[PDB]
Design a binder for this molecule. Structure first.
Ligand SMILES: [Zn+2]
Ligand SMILES: [Zn+2]
Ligand SMILES: [Zn+2]
Ligand SMILES: [Zn+2]
Length: 52
């Protein structure tokens, strides 16, 4: 089963065995783990406009 990503507006479905999981919290890309600091969009894959 896939689990969500830790960004509420992130529509990505990742797994906690492959994702960049820090401490129980799954991040799809580095961008959701940094929290989209400063600049604009998303997680490096298509059309996800998630902020942090
Ligand atoms: Zn995203
Ligand atoms: Zn994400
Ligand atoms: Zn994100
Ligand atoms: Zn993503």
């Amino acid at each position: 089963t896939l689990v969500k990503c830790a960004c509420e507006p992130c529509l990505c479905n990742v797994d906690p065995s492959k994702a960049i999981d820090r401490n129980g919290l799954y991040y799809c890309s580095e961008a959701c783990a940094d929290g989209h600091t400063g600049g604009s969009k998303g997680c490096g894959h298509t059309g996800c406009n998630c902020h942090g």
